[PDB]
Ligand binder design. Sequence first.
Ligand SMILES: *[C@@H]1O[C@H](CO[C@@H]2O[C@@H](C)[C@@H](O)[C@@H](O)[C@@H]2O)[C@@H](O[C@@H]2O[C@H](CO)[C@@H](O)[C@H](O)[C@H]2NC(C)=O)[C@H](O)[C@H]1NC(C)=O
Ligand code: NAG
Length: 237
Amino acid sequence: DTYIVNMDDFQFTFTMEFEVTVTRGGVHKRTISVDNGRPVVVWDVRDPKICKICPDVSSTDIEYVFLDIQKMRLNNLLTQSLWDTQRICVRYACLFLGFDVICDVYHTTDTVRVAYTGQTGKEIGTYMIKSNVREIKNRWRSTVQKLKQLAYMNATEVEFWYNLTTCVVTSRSNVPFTVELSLSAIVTDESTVDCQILTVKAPGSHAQRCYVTSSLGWKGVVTPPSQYRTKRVPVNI
Ligand SMILES: *[C@@H]1O[C@H](CO[C@@H]2O[C@@H](C)[C@@H](O)[C@@H](O)[C@@H]2O)[C@@H](O[C@@H]2O[C@H](CO)[C@@H](O)[C@H](O)[C@H]2NC(C)=O)[C@H](O)[C@H]1NC(C)=O
Ligand SMILES: *[C@@H]1O[C@H](CO)[C@@H](O)[C@H](O)[C@H]1NC(C)=O
């Protein structure tokens, strides 16, 4: 019931990263990521791409409005007084602890990098986030818990075969991870708001192990290479 949801909203700790990039020539981008992972919501230069297990983000939701305001702010900075730069980016990296928030705020231009660390909003930018912590946590908690579980080793799919050895690792989480062969390699990182597909191929390789290392704090192995492309899960090693 509502009572228990409230307590869980408070107790669950996580981070959200809001980022906006504005470039001279009309190319902008707004994104939301959680737990310092890949973006789960992307607005490209329309409607955003929103991860399937993400809450809906309408034009009036706090997340959308925060990013919209930052975008307008950055446009102003370019037009007003930043001609020594072709682009500007702002990033709010916020920790939601209880109903408190600590954000590190980063601004980047061609020649200048700025960081305001440890902002609590108690500077205006963080204030808006701080003032809406309960709503944000309530909206995102379930999404963030699922994203962690989807990052588990046993939710990770691995196609490790030989034709020329290839290892394709698929994850439905935004949690970062790396894929390494037991070896000259080619590494491909394809990602959408919904999944990550990391492929490592080494031509003329007879590597017998494909390792998967997760930011979540785990490492697993798939071995030996198949002759066919079939999905398996990494084994703790
Ligand atoms: C899937 O695996 C998890 C445990 O996976 C490990 O721990 C994760 C935190 C992550 O680091 C993974 O990559 C690791 O491989 C299972 O969850 C555990 O289940 C046991 C008993 O079943 C329980 O005592 C633990 O508390 C659980 N771990 C936690 C804290 O989540 C989960 O059951 C597995 N799911 C399936 C389908 O088997
Ligand atoms: C396997 O080799 C064949 C040609 O012999 C090629 O068409 C195919 O793309 C290869 N598959 C992989 C996994 O590289």
